[PDB]
Design a protein around this ligand. Sequence first.
Ligand SMILES: CCCCCCCCCCCCCCCCCC(=O)O[C@@H](COC(=O)CCCCCCCCCCCCCCC)COP(=O)(O)OC[C@H](O)CO
Lengths: 57, 120, 459, 99, 173
Amino acid sequence: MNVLQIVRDHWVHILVPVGFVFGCYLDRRSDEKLTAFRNKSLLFKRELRPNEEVTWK
Amino acid sequence: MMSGRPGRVPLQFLPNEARSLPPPKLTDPRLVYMGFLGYCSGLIDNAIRRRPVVSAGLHRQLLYVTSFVFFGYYLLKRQDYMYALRDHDMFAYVKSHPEDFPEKDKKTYGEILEEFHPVR
Amino acid sequence: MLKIIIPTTMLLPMTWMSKHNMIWINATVHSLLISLISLSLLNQLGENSLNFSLTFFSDSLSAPLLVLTTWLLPLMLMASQSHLSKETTTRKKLYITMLILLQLFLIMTFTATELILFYILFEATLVPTLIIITRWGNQTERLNAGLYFLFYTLAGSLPLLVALVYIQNTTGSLNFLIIHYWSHPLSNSWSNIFMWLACIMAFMVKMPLYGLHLWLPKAHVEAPIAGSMVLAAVLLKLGGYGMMRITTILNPLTNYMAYPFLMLSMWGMIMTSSICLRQTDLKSLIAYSSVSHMALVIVAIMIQTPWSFMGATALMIAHGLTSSMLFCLANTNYERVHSRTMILARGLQTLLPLMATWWLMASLTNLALPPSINLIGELFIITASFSWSNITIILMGMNMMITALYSLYMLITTQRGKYTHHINNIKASFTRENALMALHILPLLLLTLNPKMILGPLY
Amino acid sequence: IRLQEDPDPEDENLYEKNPDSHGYDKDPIVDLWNMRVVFFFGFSIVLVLGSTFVAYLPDYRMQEWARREAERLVKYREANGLPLMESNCFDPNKIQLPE
Amino acid sequence: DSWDKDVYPEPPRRTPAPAPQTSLPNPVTYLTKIFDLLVDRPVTLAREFIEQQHAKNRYYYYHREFRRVPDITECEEKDILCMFEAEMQWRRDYKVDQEIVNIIQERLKACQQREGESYRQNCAKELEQFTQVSKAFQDRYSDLGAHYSARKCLAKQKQRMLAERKAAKEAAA
Ligand SMILES: CCCCCCCCCCCCCCCCCC(=O)O[C@@H](COC(=O)CCCCCCCCCCCCCCC)COP(=O)(O)OC[C@H](O)CO
């Protein structure tokens, strides 16, 4: 149904939504470099559970 | 200032010993911004020549991104070199000059007399 | 963090590459969508600010302003698609480009973790607004108006630049957390006052206090509708955000040096509100009202009291939403009459009955009628000020008394009274203007149920 | 004639071309569609769920966790008879005040 | 009961037995009666239905507990790693102490209506408890500034026994 044209005039609508899902990616990538004191602060440091290896992602 | 350090061979954009540093990763955020600059030149390049900006001469702005990325990449390695160099001989100096860098005494905040000003 | 920024900047290619007539639609879609995502950021923990990285972080103060700016973004698009319809598609796209580029900077500065990073886009907001005021402004004296607005802030901002870099060379980093934890008692040495003056005057200028305020009437009146809202609803408030952030290393020097500003602000609000009582221009009257409310925050922030900060953040937002609405009221009336004089179009209620209502809660909200967020702001500030000194209530309450007279003064002169005979072009209000007006008032009363969201980190 | 210019255009009324005009833009079909966007993506998805989202937001500022701790703490304190909340905060026993 | 009686001491209610002598009917008994079988019972009927449904699928939640962590008086100078734990612990205790005053304030306000015209003398214990709390609260956090930090709280406190011990030296003479 006209798809050759609804795509051309409404392909802009996907830009921002992928931008958001992209924005989460760098958000969930930059934190990895910020690991450092992962389960290290004595306020929150505790015994590591049998299966999971990382307390906070 | 590194203008006359011992070993600086003149007109050497990237000295050989700089290769001992982690090279900039191919998608370094600084690098892609350098690629942005190449693209941003491309859009306006068709603008002055009055061409259909975005869809105008795909070859032209494609070369712009390539040129800016490479010239960016070598710049980043050179940029990383000096900062590594600036920090390197920094540290070599302070060990060579212990007397000018005293280790400040370890006093907790309990013994520190910091006067208090009320807000009233 | 990023989940707001890339959606904002990736919105820019959409408007440029969208269809010829769909620009307003798709921009409005995702601007509201961005607002929804920003609202997801509104959550805050107990005491530690929501920290994201070295480059960005948010606290209980930044978050309410962030959601306000994103919430604003659809409103200018809604408010502007009437006087820009007869314009070339490129200029319309450029106009939209200016707004979101402006709005992008606002997210950046409010979430900035480093004072210099906060500083770089602190003036960078000026460039898009300068274009908006100058190019699309609909007047003659807008040219001198843009010059006044531009130079005033720069004249105050540049001392901050010299001051800020001095902090870097003396106290290491200028990361907001590292300043707060390593704060030291600023001495009384005669250099530290000029230290104090430079770190404060920059936020003073773009928070119009008596004397340093003549740009605002020239800023607001000649600016177009979208320029007026953004300038009055967020731009006067970067100065506010700076003071809550930068006063960490200005104590106890703030205790003694606060006096000239406090007297200037407290007396200024009586003077400025008096100007409102006899303003010939509707837009100017709203503009001067912003000075009075903003000058109240000057006393609020500069007292440096837990309660004072809380009421500041309450007036921080409530005034911005209200001032944007009143500017919408003036704009929605202006093009119908093609003039700015208040007495030009009297008795509008008999002609437009719904706008009579919209003007009515708008005036009531600016009245600080309880329990509107404005009342929570002013009433909290009065108590904090009264604890600081008993006399100030004479000045404080007098402002509310003056604020009553001029607020309903526009109501009676425009809405009530006899309709003007000669005018005959007043058409029934477009439901766009009606929809936009509810877009402003409805969240305001919605905020009344949850003040704790906008009370701030002191809460 | 000073300059060869054009007379000031007259403000068209969107209503007299199409009575149902909503004031969003000239063309009727997009104007009707702009209505749907401004309301559906205005009041509907932002004001309704956004309010519920912020209203049902999880514990903000630990407003209730502190209460529960206070109840337990106050229940501990008067049980032993010592004052229910000390005038001092950082125990002076450790403090090593100068002279 | 959901809350604790020790946290909220409720003196036993003294409800007199109804012993009227006038022959004409007491109306308020009737309005309470009709209310019972028009509002109270239907509300209870719905309530017992919702409460049994709630117990059909019961999900639990607990109360988060923060273990003790070294505070700011033993944290090293600068060293923001230890300052972070210190500041957060102090601010958490600020929240508890704010709630402690809140709990006492409700108890003081609870006396007012509970004691009626006897409020002036009956709960002077409630008055002094709030007086003890408010005065001690003033010595802890008052006048700390809008940018209050555990450093300032220690600083303000360190002045207190500074003056006190100075007064003690003068008192000893
Ligand atoms: C339109 C005019 C300006 C509008 C109002 C702006 C605010 C008014 C004051 C402006 C101050 C600008 C300069 C301040 C820079 C940072 C100051 C700072 O960090 O404090 C220093 C304060 O030191 C200064 O001397 C700062 C400058 C003092 C003011 C004199 C110059 C500024 C005023 C004239 C130029 C600007 C006015 C406009 C001229 C056209 C500390 O250094 P120190 O002196 O303690 O250094 C150690 C030792 O004592 C020796 O250095």
